[PDB]
Amino acid sequence: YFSQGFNQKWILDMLHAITGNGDAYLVDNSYYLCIPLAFISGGVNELIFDILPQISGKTTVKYHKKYRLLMLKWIIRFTLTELRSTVEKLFPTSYLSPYLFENSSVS
């Protein structure tokens, strides 16, 4: 995820670390970590997934989504949210009132 983002900045042990990789096509599954970052990352929103990967196979690009998204939401690392929930609720849901109720509640 982040050394890949560091790119040129990750100049020392990060390059050395390439040698620590398992050569037995670890990447066939291990590359999912970068794709997972793509599911849970933006900025360039490129390179980490697809490109040299692919094989979405419908399922691969789903099985890797739980950890690729079950984290993407978490990635906000934020916590205002109730106010945003009520704003999101503008979509119309009946229970939209619940979002408003949350907005009406103390922080």
Partner: protein, 596 residues
């Protein structure tokens, strides 16, 4: 609450009585505190747990209660599954006592098959997994909860698809196995590679936990290896198994065992675990070499007992039994009984039933029951006696010239003798028994560790001021009985000690009439008449004598103030004591019938 309460829905009375409180008061004493549709119990245990607060949060305790809302299955839930000790008691514990008699009045083959059934198919594992996921912690916000769901998904999710032909094979057709699991999952389980995200070893687990290495690490069972007895111990035994068949295990087992990094409660599954690991041979005999080496904790022995028990259980199916027939005989026929186990010893006699004794083994045999004649050989022929009644025993004991005679003496009717024979000395921090039979007390206040008849006696004789102030000391005395029992002094049937103090709670103040007072009085008459059960005709004469002492102590302090009630209640008293005698006597020794 109003928003959803006013949906009305069904049943209503239970939750209505509940919702009506909190904000103010509680009331509904006739009902919620006594004869309401019971909210106390039905299914699960959440009912028995919440109901206590309805007594705690005001309301007249139970008021007089008198009746009930019936029980049956409820009685079971209330006494068996409930037990939420912390603070929700007070009126509720009084309610429990208000139940008392009404409650009492109501009163691995599959693994063995697996042991000698298709070893190639871990069908028992699949059955346990499905059972567990159907009903488990039922939401505790923990990592057990979190992981339980994480792994159920690799099961069924991979099986229903890629396994194709197998698909949680065992009964994944015959009993629609894993259908419930599928309902609960059937999604894109992160590729087993995602086990790296399960916190699991993502590299150690089964590969790392070599069984022989584990045995070597465990060599430090000297003592400092108990730091987690029953925890690291159970886990390590299983970890060893995980390595033993890391390769022989089914596909994607590694994701499971792996993630299971720091996972327990699998103890019931651990029997299936070692049963099919390697299976053919185990020429390490790790469970043999440790015949009795690691002494760090008794639990660990318990697990070892089940280990050994299953080893024999599997053998009896007439299987290969490579470890069992290469295991242990003496020790397996000698040590577990050191502590207990209705099989350490007993089982040891069946394979060991030749011509052998050993005083120590004889002791154990005789100690656990044995029909009071256990191997009753010799003795009489040569030199008899010295075998536990105390009648004669006292002849020769003092013939040459006390506990061996004192209990036996009290059992022979002389309370007037044991009270002198060991009025003090040692072993009897009680002595209360003698004083209660007589009503003397005079022990200052040895209140620490005091129950049954004795607990009643201390509370009973210790009555400051005199009469009129019945309600004040009356409450203190019942509560004392409920709190003393928490040291488990009388634990088993302890709840019956509440009845003696409670009849006093019901008849001590009784300002009503005093001239005729039938209100608690006629009820006691009938209850004692039908007061059959009393465990035995021993406490019947001790807890009862303490109850009689209250009658007389309250009166002793000021029988004259009582005037009109004195006349009636004393008539009621002698009459009931007489009624007691008339329908009693037949229930015990004539010695007591005559002494009183």
């Amino acid at each position: 609450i109003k928003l959803l309460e006013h949906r009305d829905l069904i049943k209503i009375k239970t939750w209505k009585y509940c919702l009506d409180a909190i904000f103010g008061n509680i009331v509904q004493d006739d009902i919620y505190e006594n004869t309401e549709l019971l909210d106390a119990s039905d299914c699960g245990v959440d009912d028995v747990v919440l109901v206590s607060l309805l007594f705690s949060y005001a309301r007249r305790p139970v008021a007089s209660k008198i009746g009930c809302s019936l029980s049956k299955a409820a009685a079971i839930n209330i006494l068996k599954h409930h037990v939420p000790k912390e603070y929700l008691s007070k009126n509720f514990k009084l309610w429990f006592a208000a139940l008392s008699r009404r409650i009492l009045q109501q009163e691995h083959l599959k693994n063995f098959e697996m042991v000698f059934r298709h070893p190639e198919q871990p069908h028992m594992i699949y059955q346990r997994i499905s059972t567990f996921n159907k009903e488990a912690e039922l939401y505790d916000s923990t990592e057990v909860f979190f992981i339980s769901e994480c792994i159920l998904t690799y099961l069924v999710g991979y099986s229903i698809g890629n396994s194709e032909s197998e698909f949680c094979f065992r009964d994944n057709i015959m009993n629609e196995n894993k259908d419930k699991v599928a309902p609960l999952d059937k999604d894109v389980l992160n590729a087993i590679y995602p086990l790296a995200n399960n916190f699991g070893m993502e590299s150690f687990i089964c590969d790392t936990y070599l069984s022989v290495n584990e045995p070597y690490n465990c060599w430090l069972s000297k003592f400092a290896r108990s730091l987690i007895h029953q925890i690291s111990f159970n886990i390590p035994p299983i970890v060893c198994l995980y390595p033993l068949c890391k390769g022989s295990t089914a596909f994607c087992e590694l994701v499971l065992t792996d993630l299971f990094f720091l996972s327990t409660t699998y103890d019931p599954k651990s029997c299936l675990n070692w049963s099919n690991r390697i299976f053919t041979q185990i020429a390490m005999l790790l469970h043999v070499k440790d015949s009795e080496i690691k002494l760090k904790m008794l639990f660990n022995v318990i697990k070892m007992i089940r280990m050994g028990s299953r080893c024999k259980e599997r053998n009896c199916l007439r299987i290969y039994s490579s470890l069992d027939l290469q295991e242990i005989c003496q020790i397996s026929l000698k040590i577990k009984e050191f502590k207990f186990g209705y099989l350490l010893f007993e089982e040891m006699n069946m394979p060991n039933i030749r011509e052998m004794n050993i005083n120590t083994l004889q002791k154990i045999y005789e100690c656990i029951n044995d029909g009071d004649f256990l191997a009753g050989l010799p003795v009489p022929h040569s030199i008899e006696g010295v075998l536990n009644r105390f009648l004669f025993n006292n002849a020769d004991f003092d013939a040459n010239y006390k506990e061996s005679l004192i209990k036996a003496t009290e059992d022979s009717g002389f309370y007037g003798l044991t009270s002198l024979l060991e009025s003090r000395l040692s072993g009897s921090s009680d002595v209360y028994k003698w004083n209660l039979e007589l009503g003397d007390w005079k022990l200052l206040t040895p209140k620490v560790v005091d129950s049954k008849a004795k607990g009643l006696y201390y509370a009973i004789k210790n009555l400051p001021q005199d009469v009129g102030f019945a309600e004040k000391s009356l409450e203190k005395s019942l509560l004392t009985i409920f709190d003393s029992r928490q040291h488990f002094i009388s634990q088993t049937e302890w709840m019956d000690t509440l009845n003696a103090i409670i009849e006093f709670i019901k008849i001590a103040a009784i300002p009503q009439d005093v001239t005729s007072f039938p209100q608690t009085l006629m009820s006691i008459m009938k209850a004692d008449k039908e007061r059959l059960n009393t465990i035995d005709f021993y406490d019947h004469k001790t807890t009862l004598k303490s109850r009689h002492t209250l009658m007389n102590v309250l009166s002793r302090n000021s029988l004259d103030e009582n005037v009109k009630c004195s006349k009636y209640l004393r008539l009621g008293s002698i009459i009931q004591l007489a009624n007691y005698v008339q329908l009693a006597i037949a229930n015990g020794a004539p010695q007591d019938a005559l002494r009183n």
